[PDB]
Amino acid sequence: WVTEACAPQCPEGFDQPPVILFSMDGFRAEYLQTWSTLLPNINKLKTCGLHSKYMRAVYPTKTFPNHYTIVTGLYPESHGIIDNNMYDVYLNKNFSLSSVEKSNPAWWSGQPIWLTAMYQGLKAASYYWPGSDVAVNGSFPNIYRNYSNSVPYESRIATLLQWLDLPKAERPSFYTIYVEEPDSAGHKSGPVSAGVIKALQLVDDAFGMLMEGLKQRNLHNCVNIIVLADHGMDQTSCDRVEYMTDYFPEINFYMYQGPAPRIRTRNIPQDFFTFNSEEIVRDLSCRKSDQHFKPYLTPDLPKRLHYAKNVRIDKVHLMVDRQWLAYRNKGNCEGGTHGYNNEFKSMEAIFLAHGPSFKEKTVIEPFENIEVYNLLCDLLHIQPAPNNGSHGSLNHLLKAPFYQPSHAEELSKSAGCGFTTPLPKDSLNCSCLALQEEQVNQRLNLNRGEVSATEKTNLPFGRPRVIQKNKDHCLLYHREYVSGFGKAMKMPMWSSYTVPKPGDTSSLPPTVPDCLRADVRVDPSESQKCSFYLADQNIDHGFLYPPAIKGNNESQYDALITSNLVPMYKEFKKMWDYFHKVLLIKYAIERNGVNVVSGPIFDYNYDGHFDAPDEITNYVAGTDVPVPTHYFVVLTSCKNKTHTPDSCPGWLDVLPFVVPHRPTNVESCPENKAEDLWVEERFKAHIARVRDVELLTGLDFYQEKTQPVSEILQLKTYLPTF
Ligand SMILES: *[C@@H]1O[C@H](CO)[C@@H](O[C@@H]2O[C@H](CO)[C@@H](O)[C@H](O)[C@H]2NC(C)=O)[C@H](O)[C@H]1NC(C)=O
Ligand SMILES: *[C@@H]1O[C@H](CO)[C@@H](O[C@@H]2O[C@H](CO)[C@@H](O)[C@H](O)[C@H]2NC(C)=O)[C@H](O)[C@H]1NC(C)=O
Numbered sequence: 251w252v253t254e255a256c257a258p259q260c261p262e263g264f265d266q267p268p269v270i271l272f273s274m275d276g277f278r279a280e281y282l283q284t285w286s287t288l289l290p291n292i293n294k295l296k297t298c299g300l301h302s303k304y305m306r307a308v309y310p311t312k313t314f315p316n317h318y319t320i321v322t323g324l325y326p327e328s329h330g331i332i333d334n335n336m337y338d339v340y341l342n343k344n345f346s347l348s349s350v351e352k353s354n355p356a357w358w359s360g361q362p363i364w365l366t367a368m369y370q371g372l373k374a375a376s377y378y379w380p381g382s383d384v385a386v387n388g389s390f391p392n393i394y395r396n397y398s399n400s401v402p403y404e405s406r407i408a409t410l411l412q413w414l415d416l417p418k419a420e421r422p423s424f425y426t427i428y429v430e431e432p433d434s435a436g437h438k439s440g441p442v443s444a445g446v447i448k449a450l451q452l453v454d455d456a457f458g459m460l461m462e463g464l465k466q467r468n469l470h471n472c473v474n475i476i477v478l479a480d481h482g483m484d485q486t487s488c489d490r491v492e493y494m495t496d497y498f499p500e501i502n503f504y505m506y507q508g509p510a511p512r513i514r515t516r517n518i519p520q521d522f523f524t525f526n527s528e529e530i531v532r533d534l535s536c537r538k539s540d541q542h543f544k545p546y547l548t549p550d551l552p553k554r555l556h557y558a559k560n561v562r563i564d565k566v567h568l569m570v571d572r573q574w575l576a577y578r579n580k581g582n583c584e585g586g587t588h589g590y591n592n593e594f595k596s597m598e599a600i601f602l603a604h605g606p607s608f609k610e611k612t613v614i615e616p617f618e619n620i621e622v623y624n625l626l627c628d629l630l631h632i633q634p635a636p637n638n639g640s641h642g643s644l645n646h647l648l649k650a651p652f653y654q655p656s657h658a659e660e661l662s663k664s665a666g667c668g669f670t671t672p673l674p675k676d677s678l679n680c681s682c683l684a685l686q687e688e689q690v691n692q693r694l695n696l697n698r699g700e701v702s703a704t705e706k707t708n709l710p711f712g713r714p715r716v717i718q719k720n721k722d723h724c725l726l727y728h729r730e731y732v733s734g735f736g737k738a739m740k741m742p743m744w745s746s747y748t749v750p751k752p753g754d755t756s757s758l759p760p761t762v763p764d765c766l767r768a769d770v771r772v773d774p775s776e777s778q779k780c781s782f783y784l785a786d787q788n789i790d791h792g793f794l795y796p797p798a799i800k801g802n803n804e805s806q807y808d809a810l811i812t813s814n815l816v817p818m819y820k821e822f823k824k825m826w827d828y829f830h831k832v833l834l835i836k837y838a839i840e841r842n843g844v845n846v847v848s849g850p851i852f853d854y855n856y857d858g859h860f861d862a863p864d865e866i867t868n869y870v871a872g873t874d875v876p877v878p879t880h881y882f883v884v885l886t887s888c889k890n891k892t893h894t895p896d897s898c899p900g901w902l903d904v905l906p907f908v909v910p911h912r913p914t915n916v917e918s919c920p921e922n923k924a925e926d927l928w929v930e931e932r933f934k935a936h937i938a939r940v941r942d943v944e945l946l947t948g949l950d951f952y953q954e955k956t957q958p959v960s961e962i963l964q965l966k967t968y969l970p971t972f
């Protein structure tokens with residue numbers, strides 16, 4: 251097989267292709283790009299089959315959370331396996347790899363792919379995989395093996411080949427096979443060592459034995475084989491470890507140490523919820539100038555990580571820097587480890603695929619492991635259980651896709667806010683001493699041609715659709731921007747505008763000061779008052795669309811209205827204004843103009859979904875105007891920089907941000923530091939996917955882009971990395 255040339259040849263009985271999911275623990279993407287030619291069996295798979303540049307793991311980049319994510323399509327917060335070592339307060343039990351509690355089904359939520367196949371009339375076998383030797387939802391796979399780490403790889407392969415030799419009635423359609431290397435070697439001697447080379451050669455022989463075994467049965471081109479990893483590997487040093495003794499005079503708390511630390515009380519379960527989590531994060535914030543970790547209260551963590559909505563995830567979290575460690579005391583440190591941020595290049599996993607369903611000799615762009623579950627379902631011809639993968643985003647991997655995706659149906663239609671009179675019925679305690687005749691409101695009145703012109707420029711991919719039931723809203727059209735106004739919350743849900751490529755940075759008009767007026771289109775009962783922000787001293791009004799970004803002085807008046815106001819904390823406003831005044835211009839030059847869609851996010855229950863009106867817990871003092879938890883900024887331009895975003899036929903380039911709306915900038919540590927040294931760093935830290943923005947807002951983007959839904963899903967699941 252290994253010497254044989256590249257190839258739907260299935261023998262008698264095999265009507266449907268069998269699916270084999272092969273995991274090689276800690277096989278980082280870097281190992282494939284550098285050492286592939288030293289591994290002839292995996293190199294043939296790379297040459298003949300399909301492979302991604304890398305597969306993004308889930309945070310924390312550990313074995314049990316990631317392996318269970320691959321088979322469920324769920325984030326650790328939803329499936330429950332948040333770490334290899336964890337504690338549940340309600341169960342009052344400790345979970346570990348060396349404990350009996352790992353076999354308790356109470357810890358395992360969701361529906362793994364073996365159960366999905368079993369519930370839909372197919373048989374499933376497994377030679378190891380976290381959760382496969384556990385009676386998840388009161389059921390084990392048809393054939394499974396109780397975990398035993400030292401069983402030789404040949405014996406694991408031989409038993410799997412016996413299962414493929416079984417009669418059609420007994421023969422499973424889905425298979426899992428797990429291997430401990432090159433993770434074990436990575437921990438021992440580091441990612442770039444002789445130990446990992448030997449381990450990579452060992453896993454290549456194991457894969458070679460499987461492929462040669464399949465070739466004898468004439469199943470080498472029949473079987474839909476997937477070779478992947480749970481996470482990557484990085485180098486650790488005893489000279490690169492932060493100690494909690496250097497920050498606290500006395501440690502009375504419990505700490506889950508390493509690359510993804512979690513802090514809780516020692517007095518469990520009595521002091522669990524009582525524990526001052528907010529004190530720990532405050533006492534660890536900006537303590538040292540060259541601090542190699544950042545404390546976070548779980549709802550404040552970057553939204554793209556989706557690591558907060560679970561009782562097992564302790565409120566205190568530490569985001570450890572590349573190649574560093576965080577321990578309780580100075581009293582293992584050498585070699586290598588994983589568990590760090592999934593965006594780190596060293597944490598990237600491998601993904602290779604071969605079979606009749608997969609495209610041959612194909613290199614695909616990086617994707618996330620949460621997407622694998624839907625692909626496994628399409629391969630097995632089964633309906634997927636509710637998961638976090640975008641069904642259809644992985645269709646470019648298949649020769650003939652099983653599922654055809656469609657755009658999310660709009661649940662609420664736009665109504666009202668039409669121009670009737672240029673005279674305001676209510677002043678709303680707003681003042682602009684510059685206006686003289688106030689007939690500038692005639693510019694807010696746009697004819698069918700004027701509306702189409704701004705819809706062509708500022709809405710090139712179509713208006714974001716409202717995927718919310720009974721959401722009273724209207725579209726507000728202006729010559730420089732278009733917004734979707736939320737009537738009940740008295741602010742816009744989204745504001746879309748395409749800034750063209752600017753010429754010079756030196757000559758830039760400032761925002762018209764002390765000028766604010768009522769929008770004649772929106773009813774005063776559905777509008778914000780300027781007096782609302784005078785009463786509340788902590789929050790002030792902010793502009794969602796920057797008035798001075800487009801046109802002239804007369805164009806600014808179209809944005810100096812009550813409908814363009816959003817509640818903002820003074821400290822957040824410093825980041826918001828700097829981004830639109832300095833960073834946005836810089837980005838607009840780099841990608842030949844940029845389309846911006848901005849708006850508020852409400853996620854008080856930190857579940858990654860948009861809040862229902864009853865879920866919002868903070869409002870503008872003495873008013874029903876809600877306070878956003880986050881603000882989104884989705885930058886869209888074209889992949890081919892020769893075209894502007896408003897006039898482009900090819901693929902689009904996206905840069906989404908989900909920035910927390912916090913009263914302080916303690917996350918950035920900006921003490922005696924100008925905005926040019928921390929604002930961009932803070933925005934880049936809170937980069938997310940378009941899908942993340944979509945779930946947090948109940949909006950759906952790019953529904954009017956002439957491209958298949960499957961291709962638009964690739965753009966929506968894309969995570970920009972720097
Ligand atoms: C995996 O290990 C478990 C636990 O040792 C085995 O389950 C026991 O099987 C016996 C006989 O079928 C039952 O009487 C017990 O009730 C089971 N549970 C326990 C906790 O003892 C299981 O059979 C093993 N599976 C394989 C494939 O070897
Ligand atoms: C889970 O493991 C932790 C850590 O070993 C145990 O924590 C101890 O709990 C007692 C109270 O029950 C405290 O007085 C100790 O200070 C804790 N020790 C540490 C090191 O944190 C906990 O009891 C275990 N729980 C179960 C149910 O096994």
Ligand SMILES: *[C@@H]1O[C@H](CO)[C@@H](O[C@@H]2O[C@H](CO)[C@@H](O)[C@H](O)[C@H]2NC(C)=O)[C@H](O)[C@H]1NC(C)=O
Nearest residue numbers: 324325328359360556636637638857858859945
């Ligand atoms: C990931 O997918 C799961 C499953 O669809 C989502 O969890 C469900 O959320 C609803 C609403 O909060 C609950 O009623 C269900 O009980 C949850 N199911 C499970 C299995 O946990 C989860 O919200 C999704 N996450 C994101 C960020 O979209």
Ligand SMILES: Nc1ncnc2c1ncn2[C@@H]1O[C@H](COP(=O)(O)O)[C@@H](O)[C@H]1O
Nearest residue numbers: 312313334347379380381397399430433
């Ligand atoms: N199903 C399992 N049950 C118990 N331990 C396991 C299982 N699968 C893997 N392991 C262990 O987890 C280790 C990898 O975990 P990690 O250190 O997080 O990369 C392996 O070397 C095994 O010893």
Ligand SMILES: *[C@@H]1O[C@H](CO)[C@@H](O)[C@H](O)[C@H]1NC(C)=O
Nearest residue numbers: 359360361362365387388635
């Ligand atoms: C658990 O199994 C039952 C059938 O026995 C099924 O109806 C249910 O949906 C399953 N739940 C999960 C989370 O897989």
Ligand SMILES: *[C@@H]1O[C@H](CO)[C@@H](O)[C@H](O)[C@H]1NC(C)=O
Nearest residue numbers: 889890891892893899900901
């Ligand atoms: C970009 O578009 C131009 C046409 O405007 C075309 O000539 C060029 O080849 C395109 N480049 C890429 C990389 O697609």
Ligand SMILES: [Ca+2]
Nearest residue numbers: 853859860861
């Ligand atoms: Ca929510």
Ligand SMILES: [Zn+2]
Nearest residue numbers: 275276313480
């Ligand atoms: Zn692992």
Ligand SMILES: [Zn+2]
Nearest residue numbers: 276433437588
């Ligand atoms: Zn490991």
